[PDB]
Ligand binder design. Sequence first.
Ligand SMILES: [Mn+2]
Ligand SMILES: [Mn+2]
Ligand SMILES: [Mn+2]
Ligand code: NA
Length: 347
Amino acid sequence: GIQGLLQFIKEASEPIHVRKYKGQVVAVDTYCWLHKGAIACAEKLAKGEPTDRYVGFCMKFVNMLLSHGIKPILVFDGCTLPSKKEVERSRRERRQANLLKGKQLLREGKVSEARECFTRSINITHAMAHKVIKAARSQGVDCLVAPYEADAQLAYLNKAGIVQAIITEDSDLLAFGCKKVILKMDQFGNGLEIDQARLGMCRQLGDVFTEEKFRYMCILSGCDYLSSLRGIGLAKACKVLRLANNPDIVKVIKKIGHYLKMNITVPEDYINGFIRANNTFLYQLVFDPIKRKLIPLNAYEDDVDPETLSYAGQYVDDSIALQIALGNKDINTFEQIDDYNPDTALY
DNA sequence: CGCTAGTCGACAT
DNA sequence: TCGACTAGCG
Ligand SMILES: [Mn+2]
Ligand SMILES: [Mn+2]
Ligand SMILES: [Mn+2]
Ligand code: NA
């Protein structure tokens, strides 16, 4: 998540409605609807009590798209990424802290304070996501479980032309290179749209509108894969790239103390972390739904060795990757929890 | 002015 | 899964 990116390129956004893609295919970052659908029933999920309200919350969004001729492809998060394990461990640490502190407030009498901690300790399990998959499949809607982060899976579906828009709330999809991203879409279907081609209307970007330079700007500002240098945001990162009259990104990062004229010490591990993060935005493992196989988000280049890309995801057998993508195989237990088969009537 | 970190919000009755 | 918002800092 690039902080403040949406307010940094506002001049490239215009409010639209989902009718502009009537009769087209639009993928969805479905986990955003699960987080909003679980707030209305946070205390129930915190106490382990059975609840299916979030199932109905995600369905009114799906049924709303079906009413406008949209063919949604619900994409769901999968396994944990090694490049995101530091953030995933911290989020799991804060969910456990709010859960323990929320249960402590139940043993006192504070009902409003315990509810606030419950809404911040929401853990969207894969079983909760699989409930929405069953409800969406009962209505004839495609559902795809990403091998890891849904962000990379959404980026491939949009680049490969399978879908023409990505309905989401995260700003990372712009860094992955999505052509059309629809943000802040209410239950009625109204939101903002940011096209990758219209990024030139942002005067504060300069010549940093190409996919490679825009990807470099998001990482230097601070993403979930690599924390930014102390004092480096989107503006200063964009300033380094505008003045970067050099295609080699490694020498430009070392020279960040010169392009900005600041006392910036760059450890060597941060340089290896940038190459680690740039390859994750480029070569993260997605799932090809047509050919049914594990492929990187972008095709491998000649100046990269895929042997050093374990942090971007681990390959498995195409049959195992298919059962995970179909939601039949659980993410953690790796056991068959369902028996859906798309052959016996996206794929 | 730009960046950082904490807070409040997302639901809905 | 995320971001919007502002006070406090350089
Ligand atoms: Mn997760
Ligand atoms: Mn994501
Ligand atoms: Mn993301
Ligand atoms: Na930053």
